[PDB]
Structures are given as structure tokens and as C-alpha cells.
Amino acid sequence: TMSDGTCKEEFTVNGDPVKKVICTGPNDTSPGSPRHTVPQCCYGFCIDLLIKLARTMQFTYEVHLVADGKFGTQERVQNSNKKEWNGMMGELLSGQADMIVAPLTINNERAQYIEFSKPFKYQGLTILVKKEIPRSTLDSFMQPF
Amino acid sequence: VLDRPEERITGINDPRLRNPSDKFIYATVKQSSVDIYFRRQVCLSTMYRHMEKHNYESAAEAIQAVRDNKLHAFIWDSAVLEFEASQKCDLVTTGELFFRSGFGIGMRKDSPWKQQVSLSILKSHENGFMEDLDKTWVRYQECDSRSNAPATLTFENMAGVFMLVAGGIVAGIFLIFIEIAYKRHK
Amino acid sequence: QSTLWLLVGLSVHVVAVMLYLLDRFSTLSSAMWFSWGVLLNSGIGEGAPRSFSARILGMVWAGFAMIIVASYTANLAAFLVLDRPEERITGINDPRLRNPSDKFIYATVKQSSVDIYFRRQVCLSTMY
Amino acid sequence: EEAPFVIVESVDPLSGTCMRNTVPCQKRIISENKTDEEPGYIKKCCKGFCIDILKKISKSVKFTYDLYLVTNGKHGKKINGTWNGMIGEVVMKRAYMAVGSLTINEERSEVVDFSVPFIETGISVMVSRSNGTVSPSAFLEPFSADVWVMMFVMLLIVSAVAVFVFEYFTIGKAIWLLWGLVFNNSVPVQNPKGTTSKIMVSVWAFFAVIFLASYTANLAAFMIQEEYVDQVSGLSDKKFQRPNDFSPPFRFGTVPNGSTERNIRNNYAEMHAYMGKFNQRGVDDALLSLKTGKLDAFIYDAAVLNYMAGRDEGCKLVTIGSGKVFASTGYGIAIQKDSGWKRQVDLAILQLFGDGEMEELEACWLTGICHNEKNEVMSSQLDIDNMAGVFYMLGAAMALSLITFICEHLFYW
Amino acid sequence: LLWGLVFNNSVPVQNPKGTTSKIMVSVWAFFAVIFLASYTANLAAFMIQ
Ligand SMILES: *[C@@H]1O[C@H](CO)[C@@H](O[C@H]2O[C@H](CO)[C@@H](O)[C@H](O)[C@H]2NC(C)=O)[C@H](O)[C@H]1NC(C)=O
Ligand SMILES: *[C@@H]1O[C@H](CO)[C@@H](O)[C@H](O)[C@H]1NC(C)=O
């Protein structure tokens, strides 16, 4: 945010007003910090969809980022027997939230304990790798010589 | 043609992805869905171990490490990664989609808002709303670049023979000097 | 394509006569012989246009014809690879063996073991 | 019955009941004479994609099941607040579930339930085949412009200094000999001063032949190229939006009273009205009327259109591609409302997605010959635009010659 | 002169009799450049081994 409390607006290529929302959460530094539950400001595809959805359904809300960056998976903690849902999935299933709007995948492991909506963007998995140009000029007069 | 790089990486069938060597590293994000998929897979266990050895904490860190040639290949979602590649730029995706699934809002069981939100999402898919969102600020806002071509001529290619130019010139100056001196002698 | 063929046959003559008239303003036929030869890289030589800049333009057009012959040898080197037959048939995975067309026929011997194998195969029934 | 998702067949002229890996599907013909009655009970047997899906589901959660074809309406639409087709058969309690080619939208979900989608799909546009052209415009790519003029000035300066030191002439001499080195053409070779300068131009020719070998190889490399385009860019394109300009891209197929029909009607009314002249006989008539010239643009469910484009002799095509899919939704398994089966069926289909088994079904139900091998025969000197640009440069050179001759005439006197 | 046509080298070009024979060697050079383009492409092809 800007020092005024909010973060300054802006405009799209068409000069359209980008919606933004105030979202608290992380320590401003996850790796090394005690905690700093500081106010931030969010805006994104999901934020637009949330805005439209709420206007269509008369909500009122407040967004806060997750505590530890992880999406979520099942785990048996140390020094106990109860296997626990990690991360954001846990922040939902414990009682800290009432909904999870994010790029969340769909698979039966999650679908045991949560209810899913219909999909709102289809996709898959794929691999990324760096692209390299370099030519192979080396003693051009000498290599065939 | 001979000096073409090993520019071929396919989806999850290439033997390289199955017999891992420390020349390549394939990483993902810990506690992520991809980790579930790879764990509950029968004959990819070696790959799964070698991957579990080097995973990351967030997507952005892995993107950066690939930009710095520390991580050789990255296996993450398709929409996020496709935008990140086509946009930032001079990064590329290889292979076909395999774990075809979707995204979705989540909720604890039994809230009426589930039954409402599903209908809302369908209605929104009908009005092209999602389509214009995508066209707005998902795609079409990138380093839209074409395919590859063979290498061209550069100055480092010419330097090896430009030396013979100046070398021959200085040799010719000395040679004409000494030849005229000799013709002055005999 | 007879178009890239026929265009030079007129361009050479028109630029040659253009430079010839230029020299006339202050050799015509000799200039024609010269332009044809220098396009063809002939062992037939003659005198250059009188002025400096006319023969300058002549040498520019010469570089142009050089690019022309480079394009020609490149196109032939290309046609080498382009006219390669459909020389690729793999084991039983290629889609062609799965969506049969009357361009190809795959036959075996009746009452043979291969017939058993292909019959008791689930999703090769069309092929069978 | 539909495209590869569900197929029917005569049973078995050899065995009385039909082959392995097939399910017996009954049909009830009621189209005979109206004299007394005949519920036409014929036992045929059906096979295909959705059939395999349900054959695995039933073993996963222990159903049993008959199979029951339908007559009144292809898929289903609202009729005075009543439903025909499969949805009609579901709401009338005659079936818990309907399988096969079935879409998902809002209006159906209002009256029936829906499983989790197991194949994404949507709208798309198929047209006649497309063709390409020449991609490169000028053959300067074999070197950088900086390379080019750097070599240029280096050679010119070295030539001038070699002349100035050999005299210790006739600028045209040096210039023309240099250009003959770079072009390997016949040149009016004057002033062959016999001295070290000859060794100089010998090294010159060394450089020149090396450079020309490099240039020919580089052009041989850069000759590899391809091209393709499609002259439509979405349902929002002016043609569809304004189907009354000079160009009449016409007869959009859109087999009526399916789904894309009602979507179009709810979004683009005038398109519907003008689309009243269309194709009405499934997909085969669509492909035919496209092949003849009876129409040029088809609109239907992408899930079958991409398949049809795949397993097709020759190569027709759809619009630009997957990135052109409008109102993307997915197929489903419509079960009766509020049944307890819904959660288990959903979880089972997700289970199938997990263990990588949809790969097998896509592997041997959904593949095509032409759905691969993207390439083209390279472009020879058929490029009229490239050669025309080069010729325009030549004419500019002619004009420069005219102007410098005028300027020389001015500078003389 | 024929060998210079086939080899594109510098030759002691004598006897340039100015007549139709010049058109003859012009067609000669046409054939020669076509043949040399063919030869270089053919060697580029046969180089694969
Ligand atoms: C679309 O709607 C029409 C409108 O009813 C359906 O059919 C018609 O064709 C039937 C068979 O020939 C007749 O029995 C109906 O009387 C006739 N209706 C009218 C108004 O003429 C048609 O089956 C529906 N589906 C398709 C694919 O066209
Ligand atoms: C409704 O029924 C009337 C006759 O009762 C018929 O003419 C009309 O076409 C029907 N319309 C719909 C939408 O069902």
C-alpha cells in the first residue's frame, strides 16, 4: 500500500479502473521474520471474479493471504498420531475461512473433505525449459581444415 | 545442421524423464497437487525420489532459478506457466498436456452458497464474461514471438578472418618496403 | 514459374539500354553483350559504361544477379529435402494403421495366427 | 447414438449375441403401423467412449444396469415447460442416469443434477482447407545489418589505404575489383599493378571465397520456413456480427435444437434470424455441404469437430484452433436430483482422472491422421512481393543514377 | 574456356571472336551456372552419412 493506507489506483490500456482490495496476511517476509500481519492490497483475475460474484449474491468480506504459502496436502505431524491437512486447505478445514478463491486444482484427494464448484478454467500440466540461441562459429577457416 | 542442440523434450514419456541424471533437475512446489499426482504413480518412483530431493517453496522462485540455469526444467500448472513463459519472455514450453483437470472454488460441505455459486459460474461462462476477462489480462499481453530459425552471421564469426586482413596488410607494407629496398640494392 | 524466369530477360535489356542512353547523353550493342554476359558470368568481356556512376549502377545490378543465383542454388538445395516421400511407417501405433483408407491395404494369410491376434484385440476392430 | 462417444451395431451374424467388450443396448421401435401396438424391442449392442467410462464406474461402485436407447428428440429442449429427449426421460423417473454426448449449461442444471465434467468442450468453427504463402521478404537475414556495413566500410578503407601505399589509383579500379571479389562476377579489371598489391588482392579473394561460402550456407539455412492463416477471428468477427456486407459467408450449419443453438439465440439474435437457412442432417451433411461449396462456416460442439477434423481424408480444418473455443464447458453424466449416488459417482470419475486411465481412452478412441505433421513445402522464387521489393530497390537505384548524373553535369560546368 | 565455364575459375581467355559465337558461350555460361548450382546442391545432399 501507499503511505495513505491504500495503494494508488491505475488504469488499463483502455484507461479502465483496475479494481483493487485491501488484503492483510503475511509478515511481509516469510523466510525470516517473527510475524508482521501487515495490510497489503490485492488485485487479480480471481479478484475480478470475486467482485462480480459478490455483487451477484450480496456478500461482504475481507481477504487475507495464507500463513505459510503452501497450497495444501495431507501430512502426519511429528510427535503425534493425528494426520493433518497442511497449509491453506487446513486454514479452510479448521475454521479460519469460509471459502477459498485461488487457482486450486481438482482431485479426489482434496474432494474427500471439501466441496468443489464447477470448473471455471480448464487446463493441464506441462514443462518449462530455457531457450538457447547460441551459434557454433569456432575457427571457421580451421574447423574443416 | 550438425551443431544443433539437444532441442527435444516431450511430455511424460521420454526416457530421460525416467532415468534421471544429475545433469538435469526437475523440481516442483512442495505440498502441491503435482506432488500428489507423482506420488500416487506406480512406475515413476525413481523420478519421484530424484524430484523430491530438489523441490522449491514457491512458483516464482522456481521461475527465477530456471532463468538462472540452476533448475533445468520445471513441471507446474499450464495456465500460470504458459502466461509466465509467453509474457516475460525468451522462455518456452515443450510437450503436451497430460493431467487434464480444472480449477475451482472450494467450500466446506453444506453451504447453500455452493448450490448458488455453481449456477453463477455457469451463467458467467455463458455470457462470455470469462472470455473477456481472459482477453483482458491473461493472454494477448505478452512478448508474442514466433518459432526458431538457424543461426546467423555475427562479428565473432568474422573476427577470425579479419585478422588475416590487417595481418596481411602490415605484412604487405613491410614486404613492399623491403622489396623496394632490395630493388634499390640489386 | 516463367515469371521470375521472364522478368530478368527484360530487366537486363532495359537497364542496359538505360545506361547506354545515359552514356549517349554525356557502345549500345557492346553494352547489351556486356550486360548479358555479366549477368551470366561469361568469359566474354567488353568495355564498361563511360561514366563512373553508370558502371556503379551496373555493378549494383551485378550484386543483384548474384543474389539471384544465390536464391536459385538455395531453392535447389531446398527442393532436395522437400521432395521426400512419406517414408515413415512404424509398428502398431501409427494412426494410419488405425484409420484405414483405400489408399493402403494391409493383408495377411487367412486362418493364420496373426488373424487370431488381431481378432481378439479390443480397439483395432475397424482395422480388423 | 452419436460420434465416437457412443456407437450402435447389429449384433453378430456369427454368434447370436455380440462380440467381447460391448454392452447389449435395447431399442424400442414404435414407428410401425398404428393398428394395435408394437414396442419394437430389438436387442442391439453398443460400444464407445462413454460406454467404457460407465463400464469402469459400474465395477468401481457396484451397479448393475440395462441400457435403453431413446426416440423422442435428439438431446432435449424445453417445450411449453416440458422436456423431450434424454433430459425428458430423466425427469419422468424412467432413468436415474443418462450418459453419452451430453453438454452442461445452466438451464438443464435447473431441473437435473450433473456429475463432474470428464471432457472439456464448447463451440468452434470449421471451414474449408487453408493455404500458405512465402514468409521471408528480403534475404538479408544471413547476416546482421551491422555485420554488413562494418565489413563494407572496413573493405573500403583497406582498399583506399592499399592504393595510397601502392602508389608510394583510379578509385573505380579498387571499387570494382572489390565488388568483383564479393560477387565473383566478370569485371573490367584494369590497373593490375604488379607488386605486393597483388598478394593483397590474393588475400582479398581468400576472404571473398570464405565469405561467399558462408553466405550460401547461411541462405541454405535460413531457407527453412513455413506459413499459415485462417481468415476468421471469432464469433465476434465482423462477418458473423454483420452478415450483410458485400461478402456473404453464409449457411452456418448449427444443427438445430441442440445446445449451441440456444446459446446463440440467447446472445446473438440477428445471427439466429439470418441463420434460419442452415444444414439439418447431422454431421455428415455438414461435411458434405462444406465440401461442395454449399457453405463455408460450420458451428458445433468442439468435442466432435476436432475429432472429425482428425480422422478425415485430406485435411479440412476448424477455426484458428483450441484457443478459439467459446463458452467452454464439459460433458457430464446427468443423474436424477438429490440421489445419494452423486457423491460416489463424482469421486469415482475423479479417481479415474487420477490414475492416468483417461490416457488409454483418448489413445484408442480419439486420434487422427492429419491431427499432426504441421509442415509445408518451402517457397521457391515464387515470392512476387519479395522480388517486387528488390526490384523497387533497383528502380530507386535507377533514380539515384539519374540524379547523380544531373549533379555531375552541374558540377562539371 | 569450356573448363572455365564448368569450374568458374580465372582462365587465360584468348580469342574473343565477336560474333554469334559470343551468344553461344553466353548460353554455355547459362548451362554452366545451372550445372554448378545442381552440383553444389547434390554435394550438400550426399554429405549426409
Ligand atoms: C427440432 O425441432 C423440430 C420441430 O418440431 C423437430 O421436428 C419436426 O420433425 C419431426 C420428424 O419429421 C416431426 O414429427 C415434427 O412434427 C416436426 N416439427 C415441426 C414443427 O415441423 C426436430 O425433430 C427437432 N430436432 C432436429 C434435430 O431437427
Ligand atoms: C406449446 O404448445 C402449443 C400447442 O398446445 C404449440 O403450438 C407450441 O408450439 C408449443 N410451444 C412450446 C414452446 O412448447
Q: Are D44 and D11 in contact (CB under 8 A)?
A: yes
- Cell, residue A124: 493441464
The β-bridge partners of A41 are A22
Q: Locate cell 491395404: which residue?
A: C105
Q: Are A96 and A63 in contact (CB under 8 A)?
A: no
Q: How far is CA E24 from CA C42, C107, D127, E29, E30, in A?
A: 10, 59, 55, 9, 10
Phi, psi (rounded to 5 degrees) for B44: -125, 30
* Chain A positions in Cβ-Cβ contact with residue B23 (cut-off 8 Å): none
Does residue C69 sit at the E interface (CB-CB below 8 Å)?
yes
DSSP H helix total and E strand total for chain C: 4, 0
d(CA D2, CA C123): 18
- Residues in CB range of D272: below 8 A, 6 or more apart: D264, D265
Let me know if D178 is exposed, middle or buried by CB neighbors in 10 A (0-12, 13-18, 19+): buried
Let me know if B43 is exposed, middle or buried by CB neighbors in 10 A (0-12, 13-18, 19+): exposed
- Cell, residue B143: 512478448
Q: Locate cell 482434496: which residue?
A: A110
β-strand B91-94 against B101-102: which pairing, if any? unpaired
Best D114, D115, D195, D196 residue to mutate vs chain B (most B CBs within 10 Å): D196
- In 3D space, the residue among D130, D85, D131 whose CA is nearest the CA of residue D112 turns out to be D85
Phi, psi (rounded to 5 degrees) for D102: -140, 130
d(CA A1, CA A117): 32
Q: Are D367 and D132 in contact (CB under 8 A)?
A: no
B60: amino acid identity, one letter:
A
CA dihedral B88, B89, B91, B92 (to 10 degrees): 100
Angle between helices B129-137 and A45-57 (to 10 degrees): 150
- Residues in CB range of D300: below 8 A, 6 or more apart: D123, D124, D126, D253, D254, D255, D260, D283, D286
d(CA B166, CA D386): 37
Q: Are E8 and E36 in contact (CB under 8 A)?
A: yes
Q: Are E29 and E13 in contact (CB under 8 A)?
A: no
d(CA D311, CA D249): 26
- Cell, residue B2: 550438425
DSSP A68: S
Q: Are E5 and E25 in contact (CB under 8 A)?
A: yes
- In 3D space, the residue among D71, D52, D44 whose CA is nearest the CA of residue D6 turns out to be D52
Q: How far is CA B78 from CA A123, B34, D355, in A?
A: 6, 12, 19
Q: Locate cell 568474422: which residue?
A: B158
- Residues in CB range of D58: below 8 A, 6 or more apart: D64, D65
Mark the breaks in chain E: residue after which each occurs, C to N over 2.5 Å.
none
Instruction: Name the residue of D257, D272, D283, D285 to mutate for ligand 1: max ligand atoms within 8 A of Cβ.
Output: D257
β-strand A63-64 against A21-24: which pairing, if any? parallel
- In 3D space, the residue among D6, D85, D49 whose CA is nearest the CA of residue D262 turns out to be D85
Q: Are B125 and D123 in contact (CB under 8 A)?
A: no
The β-bridge partners of B27 are B74
β-strand D82-83 against D97-98: which pairing, if any? unpaired
d(CA B155, CA D150): 9
Mark the breaks in chain A: residue after which each occurs, C to N over 2.5 Å.
none
d(CA D303, CA D300): 9
Phi, psi (rounded to 5 degrees) for C39: -65, -45
Query: Helix, strand, or coil here: E19?
Result: coil
Hey, are the CB atoms on A141 and D210 less than 8 Å from each other?
yes
CA-based angle B25:B31:B33, to the nearest 5? 85
**Cβ atoms within 10 Å, residue D189:** 13
Segments in D184-315 forming alpha helices (H): 196-222, 238-241, 260-267, 269-275, 284-292, 302-310
DSSP H helix total and E strand total for chain B: 7, 5
d(CA B78, CA B83): 8
H or E element that contains B10: none
B5: amino acid identity, one letter:
P
The ligand that comes nearest to the alpha carbon of residue D257 is 1
- Cell, residue D9: 451395431
- Residues in CB range of D201: below 8 A, 6 or more apart: D177, D181
d(CA D346, CA A111): 9
- Kindly calculate the radius of gyration of chain D based on its CA atoms and give it in whole angstroms: 35
DSSP string computed for B37-77: HHHT-GGGHHHHHHHHTS-BS-HHHHHHHHHTTSS-EEEEE
The β-bridge partners of A17 are A11
Q: What length does chain E have? A: 49
Query: Helix, strand, or coil here: A128?
Result: strand
CA-based angle D304:D305:D307, to the nearest 5? 65
DSSP H helix total and E strand total for chain A: 3, 8
d(CA D308, CA D287): 9
CA-based angle D139:D140:D143, to the nearest 5? 130
Does residue B176 sit at the D interface (CB-CB below 8 Å)?
yes
β-strand D317-318 against D120-127: which pairing, if any? antiparallel
Instruction: Give the residue from chain E lying closest to C73, CA to CA.
Output: E37
Q: Are 3 or more Cβ–Cβ pairs between C and D shorter than 8 Å?
A: yes
Phi, psi (rounded to 5 degrees) for D8: -115, 160
Taking the centre of ligand 2 as the mean of its atom positions, its distance from the CA of residue D334, in whole angstroms, is: 26
- Cell, residue D222: 535460413
d(CA C28, CA C10): 16
- Cell, residue C70: 544465390
Q: What part of A 32-91 touches D (C-beta under 8 Å)?
A: none
d(CA D180, CA C69): 15
Query: Helix, strand, or coil here: C17?
Result: helix
